[PDB]
Amino acid sequence: MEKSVSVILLAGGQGPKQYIPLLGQPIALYSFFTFSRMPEVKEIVVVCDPFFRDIFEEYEESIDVDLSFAIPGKERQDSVYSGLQEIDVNSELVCIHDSARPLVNTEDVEKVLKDGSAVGAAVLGVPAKATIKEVNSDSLVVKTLDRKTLWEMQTPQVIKPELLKKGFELVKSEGLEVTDDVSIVEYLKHPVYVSQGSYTNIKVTTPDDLLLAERILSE
Amino acid sequence: MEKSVSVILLAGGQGPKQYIPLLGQPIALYSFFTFSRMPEVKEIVVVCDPFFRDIFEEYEESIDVDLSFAIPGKERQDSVYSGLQEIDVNSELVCIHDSARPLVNTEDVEKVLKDGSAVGAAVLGVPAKATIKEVNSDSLVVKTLDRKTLWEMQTPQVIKPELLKKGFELVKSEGLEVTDDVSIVEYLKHPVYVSQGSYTNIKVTTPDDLLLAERILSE
Ligand SMILES: O=c1c(Cc2ccccc2)c(Cl)nc2[nH]cnn12
Ligand SMILES: O=c1c(Cc2ccccc2)c(Cl)nc2[nH]cnn12
Ligand SMILES: [Cu+2]
Ligand SMILES: [Cu+2]
Ligand code: NA
Ligand code: NA
Numbered sequence: 001m002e003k004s005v006s007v008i009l010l011a012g013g014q015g016p017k018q019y020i021p022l023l024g025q026p027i028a029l030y031s032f033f034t035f036s037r038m039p040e041v042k043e044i045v046v047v048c049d050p051f052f053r054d055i056f057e058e059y060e061e062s063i064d065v066d067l068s069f070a071i072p073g074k075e076r077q078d079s080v081y082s083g084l085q086e087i088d089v090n091s092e093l094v095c096i097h098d099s100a101r102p103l104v105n106t107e108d109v110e111k112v113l114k115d116g117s118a119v120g121a122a123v124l125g126v127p128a129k130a131t132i133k134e135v136n137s138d139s140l141v142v143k144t145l146d147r148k149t150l151w152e153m154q155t156p157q158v159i160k161p162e163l164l165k166k167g168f169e170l171v172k173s174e175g176l177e178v179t180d181d182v183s184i185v186e187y188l189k190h191p192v193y194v195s196q197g198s199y200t201n202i203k204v205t206t207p208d209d210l211l212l213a214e215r216i217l218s219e
Numbered sequence: 220m221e222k223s224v225s226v227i228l229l230a231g232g233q234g235p236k237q238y239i240p241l242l243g244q245p246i247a248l249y250s251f252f253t254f255s256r257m258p259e260v261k262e263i264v265v266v267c268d269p270f271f272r273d274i275f276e277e278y279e280e281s282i283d284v285d286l287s288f289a290i291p292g293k294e295r296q297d298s299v300y301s302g303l304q305e306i307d308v309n310s311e312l313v314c315i316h317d318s319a320r321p322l323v324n325t326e327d328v329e330k331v332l333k334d335g336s337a338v339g340a341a342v343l344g345v346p347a348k349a350t351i352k353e354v355n356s357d358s359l360v361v362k363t364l365d366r367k368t369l370w371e372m373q374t375p376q377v378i379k380p381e382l383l384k385k386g387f388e389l390v391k392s393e394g395l396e397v398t399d400d401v402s403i404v405e406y407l408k409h410p411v412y413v414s415q416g417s418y419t420n421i422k423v424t425t426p427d428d429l430l431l432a433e434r435i436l437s438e
Contacts, residue, residue, distance in 0.1 A: 123360075125352075125354070128349075130371045131399040132370065132372070133370055133401065134367050134370075135368060135369075139413050139415075140411060140412060141404075141410075141412075144405065147398075149354060150353055150354075150369075151353075153349065153350040153352060180350040185360075186362045186363065186364065187364065191359045192359060192360040194354045194359070195358075208427075208431045
């Protein structure tokens with residue numbers, strides 16, 4: 001559905017890597033433009049410090065979405081909630097994206113949007129390549145014989161706004177801890193789909209990442 | 220205990236990245252030399268294709284360990300087993316290392332050796348930074364409310380040889396699947412300690428990794 005999705009673009013982190021260029025363009029703008037071109041996307045709520053607004057506002061008349069801003073909160077989830085208060089009163093779906101993932105492919109965004117529409121909550125993920133284990137408080141491996149297949153979550157995270165709101169309300173009403181980027185939905189009974197993305201959708205955290213990102217962009 | 224540990228250096232993978240230089244020295248030699256200098260280490264069994272033996276044999280008279288070779292097997296575990304058949308009949312401990320991890324620090328090797336001696340089985344690991352979840356066959360997140368803290372396993376993997384042998388025998392006698400780098404020990408009831416290592420102990424898999432490795436070596 002055209003113009004049914006609101007994007008919350010998380011660009012509130014502080015050194016900032018998401019404004020450093022790749023091929024002359026600030027990292028945040030890559031995903032921003034990917035989303036703007038998609039007919040599905042009605043609006044982009046950028047969550048960023050006022051200082052960086054111009055980075056995005058420069059393109060406002062050139063992009064085929066509405067542009068809005070929200071103020072960052074203290075933790076990532078707070079930034080999500082801030083963006084959430086700015087989305088359209090009738091968008092059917094919210095698409096949360098870390099601006100430090102510039103390389104997300106349109107085709108993968110399309111996938112997670114569809115899955116999110118279908119299921120109600122979906123996140124892009126890839127199978128974890130390393131050997132990963134739970135470790136207990138005595139620093140021992142928690143052993144599994146069964147087939148635990150672990151996936152690394154990326155973004156977008158796509159969710160029906162009502163469902164997200166229900167999660168934030170539960171976490172507030174019960175004072176629940178939020179310890180990774182899917183904790184809010186984990187407290188709900190509603191299913192979360194994992195849409196298979198691409199290993200190229202890396203998050204730029206380190207200086208190493210800047211050249212890797214630039215090197216993928218080479219294509 | 221001086222000269223109590225046998226190292227199995229896994230260098231049988233095939234493009235090969237573990238022989239590509241960092242600062243002019245083949246990646247495999249970095250960990251090789253780290254181990255050779257440690258008084259604990261009696262011997263290094265290198266598991267590598269005969270073609271590359273000279274890479275290591277060149278240094279034989281210069282290193283304070285015995286050097287032995289084993290032939291790679293088909294899968295990593297087979298390479299482990301091949302090396303295992305070459306270690307000293309009385310070493311108290313075997314230290315399995317991926318040669319593609321050149322940056323392992325002496326101090327972290329010392330830690331996992333101690334832990335392995337104490338517990339019987341230990342592996343170097345670091346806390347996973349990404350959000351990682353189990354995903355079921357319907358591509359849904361397997362939700363946890365509890366505090367699952369996930370760690371990424373590195374090498375060394377340090378184990379009493381008898382315990383390793385018992386694992387390989389069990390996996391053979393029962394035809395058990397080996398699907399990640401701790402599966403053999405997971406079938407045993409004996410505990411596996413996770414020694415906290417360093418995020419710098421990366422595995423060189425990609426071309427990206429070669430520059431990251433080189434860039435860490437800069438120090
Ligand atoms: O559950 C969420 C979600 C919502 C979500 C999760 C997975 C799939 C779709 C939406 C978001 Cl966007 N951010 C955080 N931080 C902590 N938990 N959390
Ligand atoms: O359990 C092992 C071990 C032994 C081990 C695991 C963890 C700690 C110490 C030794 C090794 Cl070296 N390699 C593999 N491949 C598959 N399983 N597996
Ligand atoms: Cu990175
Ligand atoms: Cu890598
Ligand atoms: Na401009
Ligand atoms: Na030489």
